Curated annotation (Swiss-Prot):
Carboxylesterase acting on esters with varying acyl chain length. Disulfide bonds: none annotated. It comes from Actinidia eriantha. Keywords: Hydrolase, Serine esterase. A motif (Involved in the stabilization of the negatively charged intermediate by the formation of the oxyanion hole) lies at residues 73-75. PANTHER family: ARYLACETAMIDE DEACETYLASE, CARBOXYLESTERASE 120-RELATED. The active site is at residues 152, 255, 285. Gene3D superfamilies: alpha/beta hydrolase. Paraoxon binds at residues 75-76, 152-153. This is Carboxylesterase 1. It holds the Pfam family Abhydrolase_3. InterPro entries: AB_hydrolase_3, AB_hydrolase_fold, Carboxylest/Gibb_receptor, Lipase_GDXG_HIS_AS. One of its GO terms (molecular function) is carboxylesterase activity.
Length: 307
């Protein structure tokens, strides 16, 4: 297991996280060297959740507000933080190169807090942002142009948050959602798709690891056709379409979850939702978090999407 996930499974249905995942401290002061300023704001102390804001330095040299991206990190629902270095650095790159202010949500982790805990934290964060008088948000973020985004498990959260938000869109004002960005979103199912068969022996996400992730994340005794795991009447898509939200879906052929991501994109398209799909040859799951060239290329497409 340690070859794939930095966890130990205990004989009491719990896990242990014995390998520290590096984190980066916030840097709120523009006299620092950072090209992006960051600070953490407590969300809910009973859930120990917080939000890290990323404000690109370039925003301090004009009086224009930038679109706001509400972001959810990946990690199988079971690992990582908004302050994990790999996610902090991606968000700093994204802020600079897509020209956005980011609010990255530190949601509760499974199995201590199985789904839907992370989705509830996503909605709490939206409610909190809408009501916020934080000075970075009020002076530099455009509440009228908000995007919900996430990577891997966080893209699953972003998708479920997007469905819930669409149902309460009027209630979220002054925040106006304009789109969803689903970066290699994590979905599953009881039956294997073709890509799950083709990539069963993947070097990072083989079948048994994916199955473990769902086992630890879904409600006890659910199976992988549970709606949190397998997203595909999709009446919700009528609301997305009616609100005029655009949806970006990205992924690559070397990710075992590609077939489900592509099926979601096709179902959205079938329901008349404005979809921007970029599915690439090759790669592997989370390659953009490791490959600065692939990240660079994605930021080109995200900049245009957000504009």
């Amino acid at each position: 297991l340690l070859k794939y996930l930095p966890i130990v499974l205990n004989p009491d249905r719990t896990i242990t996280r014995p390998i520290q995942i590096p984190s980066t401290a916030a840097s709120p002061d523009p006299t620092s060297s950072s090209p992006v300023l960051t600070k953490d704001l407590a969300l809910n102390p009973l859930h120990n959740t917080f939000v890290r804001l990323f404000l690109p330095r370039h925003a301090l040299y004009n009086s224009a507000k930038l679109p706001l991206v509400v972001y959810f990190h990946g990690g199988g629902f079971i690992l990582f933080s908004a302050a994990s270095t790999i996610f902090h650095d991606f968000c700093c790159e994204m802020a600079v190169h897509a020209g956005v202010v980011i609010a990255s949500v530190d949601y509760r982790l499974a199995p201590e807090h199985r789904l839907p805990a992370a989705y509830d934290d996503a909605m709490e964060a939206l409610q909190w942002i809408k009501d916020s008088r934080d000075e970075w948000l009020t002076n530099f973020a455009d509440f009228s142009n908000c995007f919900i985004m996430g990577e891997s498990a966080g893209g699953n959260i972003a998708y479920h948050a997007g469905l819930r938000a669409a149902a309460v869109a009027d209630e979220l004002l002054p925040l106006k959602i304009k789109g969803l960005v689903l970066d290699e979103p994590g979905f599953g199912g009881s039956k294997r798709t073709g890509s799950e068969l083709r990539l069963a022996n993947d070097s990072r996400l083989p079948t048994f690891v994916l199955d473990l992730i769902w086992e630890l994340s879904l409600p006890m005794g659910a199976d992988r056709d549970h709606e949190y795991c397998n997203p595909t009447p999709l009446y919700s898509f009528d609301k997305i379409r009616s609100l005029g939200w655009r949806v970006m879906v990205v992924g690559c052929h070397g990710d075992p979850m590609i077939d489900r991501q592509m099926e979601l994109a096709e179902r959205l398209e079938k329901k008349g939702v404005d979809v921007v799909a970029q599915f690439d040859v090759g790669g592997y799951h989370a390659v953009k978090l490791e490959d600065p060239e692939k990240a660079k290329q994605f930021f080109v497409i995200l900049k245009k999407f957000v504009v």
